[PDB]
Amino acid sequence: APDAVFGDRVRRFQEFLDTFTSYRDSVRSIQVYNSNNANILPHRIIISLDDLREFDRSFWSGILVEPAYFIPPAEKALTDLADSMDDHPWKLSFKGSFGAHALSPRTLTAQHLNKLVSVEGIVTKTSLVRPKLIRSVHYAAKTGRFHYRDYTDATTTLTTRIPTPAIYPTEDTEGNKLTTEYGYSTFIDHQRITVQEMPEMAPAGQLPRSIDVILDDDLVDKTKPGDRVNVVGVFKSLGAGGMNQIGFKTLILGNTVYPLHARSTGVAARQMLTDFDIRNINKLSKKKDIFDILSQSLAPSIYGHDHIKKAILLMLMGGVEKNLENGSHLRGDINILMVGDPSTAKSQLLRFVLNTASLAIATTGRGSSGVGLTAAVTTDRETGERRLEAGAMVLADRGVVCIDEFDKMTDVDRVAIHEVMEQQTVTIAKAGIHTTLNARCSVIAAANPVFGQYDVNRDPHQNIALPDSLLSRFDLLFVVTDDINEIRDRSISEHVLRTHRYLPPGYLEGEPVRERLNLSLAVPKLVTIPFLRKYVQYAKERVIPQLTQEAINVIVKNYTDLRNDDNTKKSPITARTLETLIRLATAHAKVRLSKTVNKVDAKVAANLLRFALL
Amino acid sequence: APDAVFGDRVRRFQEFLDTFTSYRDSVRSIQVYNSNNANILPHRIIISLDDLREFDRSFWSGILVEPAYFIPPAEKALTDLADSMDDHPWKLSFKGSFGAHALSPRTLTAQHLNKLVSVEGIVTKTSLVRPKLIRSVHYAAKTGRFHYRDYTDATTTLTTRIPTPAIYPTEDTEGNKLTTEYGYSTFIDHQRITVQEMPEMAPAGQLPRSIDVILDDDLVDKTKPGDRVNVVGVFKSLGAGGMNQIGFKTLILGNTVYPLHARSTGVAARQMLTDFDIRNINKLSKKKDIFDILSQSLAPSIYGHDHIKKAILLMLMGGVEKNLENGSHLRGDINILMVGDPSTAKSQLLRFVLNTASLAIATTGRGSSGVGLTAAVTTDRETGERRLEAGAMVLADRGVVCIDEFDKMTDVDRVAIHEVMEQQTVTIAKAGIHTTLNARCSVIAAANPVFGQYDVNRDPHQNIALPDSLLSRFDLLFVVTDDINEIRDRSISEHVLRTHRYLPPGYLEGEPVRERLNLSLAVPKLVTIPFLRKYVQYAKERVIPQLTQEAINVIVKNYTDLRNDDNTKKSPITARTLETLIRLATAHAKVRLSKTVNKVDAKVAANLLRFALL
DNA sequence: GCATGCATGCGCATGCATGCATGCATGCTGCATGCATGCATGCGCATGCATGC
DNA sequence: GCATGCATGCGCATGCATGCATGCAGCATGCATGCATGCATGCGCATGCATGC
Numbered sequence A, B: 001a002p003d004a005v006f007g008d009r010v011r012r013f014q015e016f017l018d019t020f021t022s023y024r025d026s027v028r029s030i031q032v033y034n035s036n037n038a039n040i041l042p043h044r045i046i047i048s049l050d051d052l053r054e055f056d057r058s059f060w061s062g063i064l065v066e067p068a069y070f071i072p073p074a075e076k077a078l079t080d081l082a083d084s085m086d087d088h089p090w091k092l093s094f095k096g097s098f099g100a101h102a103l104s105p106r107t108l109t110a111q112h113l114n115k116l117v118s119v120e121g122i123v124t125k126t127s128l129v130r131p132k133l134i135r136s137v138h139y140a141a142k143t144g145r146f147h148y149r150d151y152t153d154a155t156t157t158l159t160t161r162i163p164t165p166a167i168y169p170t171e172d173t174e175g176n177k178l179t180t181e182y183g184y185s186t187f188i189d190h191q192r193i194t195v196q197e198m199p200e201m202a203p204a205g206q207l208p209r210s211i212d213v214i215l216d217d218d219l220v221d222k223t224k225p226g227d228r229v230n231v232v233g234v235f236k237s238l239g240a241g242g243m244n245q246i247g248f249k250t251l252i253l254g255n256t257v258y259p260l261h262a263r264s265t266g267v268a269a270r271q272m273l274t275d276f277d278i279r280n281i282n283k284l285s286k287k288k289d290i291f292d293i294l295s296q297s298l299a300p301s302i303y304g305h306d307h308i309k310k311a312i313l314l315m316l317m318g319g320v321e322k323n324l325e326n327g328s329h330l331r332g333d334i335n336i337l338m339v340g341d342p343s344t345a346k347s348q349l350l351r352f353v354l355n356t357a358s359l360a361i362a363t364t365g366r367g368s369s370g371v372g373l374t375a376a377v378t379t380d381r382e383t384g385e386r387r388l389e390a391g392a393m394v395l396a397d398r399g400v401v402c403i404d405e406f407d408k409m410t411d412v413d414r415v416a417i418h419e420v421m422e423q424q425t426v427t428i429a430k431a432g433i434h435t436t437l438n439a440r441c442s443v444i445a446a447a448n449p450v451f452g453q454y455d456v457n458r459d460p461h462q463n464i465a466l467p468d469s470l471l472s473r474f475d476l477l478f479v480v481t482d483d484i485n486e487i488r489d490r491s492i493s494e495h496v497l498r499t500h501r502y503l504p505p506g507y508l509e510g511e512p513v514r515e516r517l518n519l520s521l522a523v524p525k526l527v528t529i530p531f532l533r534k535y536v537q538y539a540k541e542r543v544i545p546q547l548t549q550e551a552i553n554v555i556v557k558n559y560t561d562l563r564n565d566d567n568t569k570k571s572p573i574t575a576r577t578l579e580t581l582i583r584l585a586t587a588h589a590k591v592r593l594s595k596t597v598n599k600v601d602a603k604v605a606a607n608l609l610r611f612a613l614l
Numbered sequence C: 001g002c003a004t005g006c007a008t009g010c011g012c013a014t015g016c017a018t019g020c021a022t023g024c025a026t027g028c029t030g031c032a033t034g035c036a037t038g039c040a041t042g043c044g045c046a047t048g049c050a051t052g053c
Numbered sequence D: 001g002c003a004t005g006c007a008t009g010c011g012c013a014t015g016c017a018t019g020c021a022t023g024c025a026g027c028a029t030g031c032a033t034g035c036a037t038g039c040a041t042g043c044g045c046a047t048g049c050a051t052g053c
């Protein structure tokens, strides 16, 4: 029967939902969607814990401290408003600043039980999504009547109830036999996941701590193993810890699950674009020095190397791939290789690409070997089946892979990369498993000269020492050297000393600067690094240029000319060069946001290739 | 959760209540009463089982056969209509013809369990009305909050439920002590009664059969021990008949309780007066021979005895009694005595008064003795207290007592009747009991002459032989004799032979006429016996005449004249004669329906007294 | 007016429906034993590759 | 070209999380007796009345 306290807690949350009206229209929107569009959306909204502090302090403190008394009231209050604006229950989500309830699996203790918490870590394993039976319907052929029953369990209501163990009906109240109507019963899905502390926040050489999260219905398939995640929910004690006859059974009943992005991880980074942002992105295009402004802002601290600055942007945007009715796939990724002297900032260039790209994985020479790049087979304890867990290149699909110290790899891995750089498929034929996986990735790499330093007397085949088959699979092979000089020594020295003296905004000189780990959230003046990602993200999703009848003649001339010319080149010439020219041409048209490839872009591609060749 | 069958059964009873709209306005009336009048009325109505047969046959058959499935639906349907017309639950009652479900406690067997039945019999014992606790409210001084709980049992719902044995709360959910708020809790009353087969329908010399009826709330104090009753309800089996370890526990859960009237019983007879009836009753008055027409219709089959015919009507209407501020009570009942020869139809006159009067008890000489007339003391097994059960004259309050063979009584009962005929109180002083009871009754009696036949040679003191104290307590002493003759022999013979040849309407001559037991229900041409009761009932309730300054002189003259006159009279003269004249005068004014006594009535009273005296 | 037998209350004795604790034994049930089963582990050996000479 | 040493997969024993039945015992519930209690029975005895003579 009605409780006064429940009623007042509902009333105050009705007033809260009335004062800040940004949540009512959000509820309106989902009904508008599910009616006008008949992908049915789930019945949920998100609340800010910062708004609650301003509106009411005690109600805020109560959800932080006593969720099991203030959450069902708020949910019922929300359901009432939903049924009000209406011409299936509803549930809430939580965001804002939590404070002392922003914990990790190691610092989460028994004094935080029965409160709402935020937990950080890595997802290590997910289970199979299973149906759960709620209501079952039956039929009696001797009376022409249908009967039903309801089932419930302890992980669906935040407060403790008196158990009702009902049974599965096979028989009528007179004895008539009942047929089970599987299509008329209701089933709701279930999944369980385990979380662990992230490897770069955990103490070195110490065993890790983990926590179990239970998800149901709509939150059931949001993540995969090996992800950075933030979860919010109630830390619940269950059952009796052996007092009917280790301790109590503890787990989190999830309500919010946020994917997070980190360096060298399989979760991509995306940002929400404001119309103001779009206006600047589109304004920048018309000025006909877009390429130079964007190129010089690519790690401006390294000096020169402007053509590699161009090439990295061309790889970051990339062309277009094409599928024919036949069933043929034609590649559209660009790959870069760099050979130079042992103090030419190769690793700074690689690390910058790792920091800026939306999805990137870092590998160093012999570091990754064999299965570590392609895939490996494991066994599942429960079902007993043999499964696959992804290697580096399977994870970096529609992305970039950074290979530092490229020349240190064995031939066995080289033959495996031959298949990824051209067909972009990985084929596995192990005991019982025969499957093909997708790996559509671009590759950037850096290599050391065989003789320590580049020898101008000898020809390239004696300095590089890589097979022609692998060389042809790289679109661009750049060579760089540091010529000892005085003019450039002065110029470089002065600039490098400029850089080494820089105050971050807001410190008195002397004060040490402070380091923090950057965890993201997923959904001629130089341009800011945070804006370059916004530019690229729009430039890939929106523009898909088509080929014109003009520039084909330029490409044809350049390819024919190169193949019937007799200068010693830094790479062999094949049909791969023919396709490379088109990929390069379409990348520049992605830079310009035009719907068609053009002649100026074709000549920029040709100029770049010829500089990198001769 | 909702049942389809329950829903359809509710819907059809909504249609039934809609087609016959005589039950909706009855519900309207009770709300009108309880709002306008703020004696709150109970929430109940009465349905006809004859209407149900015409509207739907299967629904009728279902209530007769399956009450436990069609009664809760009908009650809910009624509650919905009540809450509809509204600008606490409601319940039903049943009347009409039942058929094979009109049984007695002897013919009620185990094949009628779980069906609605009608039972006839006599109420033999009633229990004490006790409160029953439903909802209890509490207070916590450490939190300023009030808590409640609900209780239920098996005798409140017609269908079987799963028991919930809740406990009495003394403690809060934290441990705070609670005060019990007796004024805020809800209590509903309870009573149990036993029924037995009536003595004039039961087989002679055989032990009787009985049945238990449970009544609750509003039906809790409708009857008293020693009443003819008709009860309708469900015949229920309760508990487990020893199968957890005689047979099952059987009882009736009452819904309807009707009092019935029978000859020589304490339940009065009343009829509902139609406006058409009132018009005839009031029309008859204006004609100035009302007394003669009503008098000659009093058992017309007995011949002559017209002055006794008048006297019986005067007793049947009676005067008015008066209470003073002082605390004095002045009598208003009339009493009659008759002395005559052994073939003068005395007992026919007595039996006619027994059959016609609204409440009458028959006693014959030595038949009733001692406690049988006044009262007796018994003991109650449960509470152990000494109680009183009423004798004949305590039961016949505001009524008549017929004593045939008056001269056969002993002096001990005569002294007890001295107190009833004058002060109309009975005083009991037994061990522990000292109480005074009300007995306001009129008395008619008949006595035998001492010498077999009335001897004209001797004076009345030698023929009657009753004490002057008792004679003065009788208003009228009539004497009658049969004078052997020829003219009156012919006249009486012919009339008596007329009577002995009479065909009831609708029989071929020869066919025996059929006897039936007449059980009533409670709430110059000759006038019908059924109408005389209607006349008397209105004449007593409505008219209460007052005394005028005119007729007092007539009464004064007659009383003075009689007390200073020297003829041998048939009774002594006292102030009892003075009061008798006023009682007689006011009775005739009750016959005329005038608001004041008059002179013509006074002279009729004087004439009647002087005929009965001389 | 006197003598008599009946019916009315006293004054014994006994049985009888209610009601509740105690010692013995019933009847179930939670606990300790034994065991089948299938997945993972910790291991030594044979092959194919990379690094000199 | 040739000789050598390391990483990878094959082959072999062993331990160990799940899971379920059975004999034995510990353990609480229902039953049989035993009695206390207060009411009602029914049974002879004394008194006050109604009848006969």
Ligand SMILES: Nc1ncnc2c1ncn2[C@@H]1O[C@H](COP(=O)(O)OP(=O)(O)O)[C@@H](O)[C@H]1O
Pocket (backbone or CB within 6 Å): A301, A302, A303, A304, A341, A342, A343, A344, A345, A346, A347, A348, A496
């Ligand atoms: N052209 C350059 N401009 C600025 N700094 C440079 C340049 N070349 C090298 N450096 C600096 O010198 C160091 C080069 O180290 P590293 O990145 O290991 O070189 P490499 O990868 O070529 O062996 C870094 O401090 C880098 O910042």
Ligand SMILES: Nc1ncnc2c1ncn2[C@@H]1O[C@H](COP(=O)(O)OP(=O)(O)O)[C@@H](O)[C@H]1O
Pocket (backbone or CB within 6 Å): B301, B302, B303, B304, B341, B342, B343, B344, B345, B346, B347, B348, B496
């Ligand atoms: N005056 C009368 N008129 C009609 N019938 C009479 C009359 N007197 C007597 N009777 C009849 O004679 C019989 C009298 O019997 P009963 O009532 O016992 O007489 P009583 O009571 O006077 O001794 C009945 O059949 C009655 O109907």
Ligand SMILES: [Mg+2]
Pocket (backbone or CB within 6 Å): A346, A347
């Ligand atoms: Mg380096």
Ligand SMILES: [Mg+2]
Pocket (backbone or CB within 6 Å): B346, B347
């Ligand atoms: Mg008689």
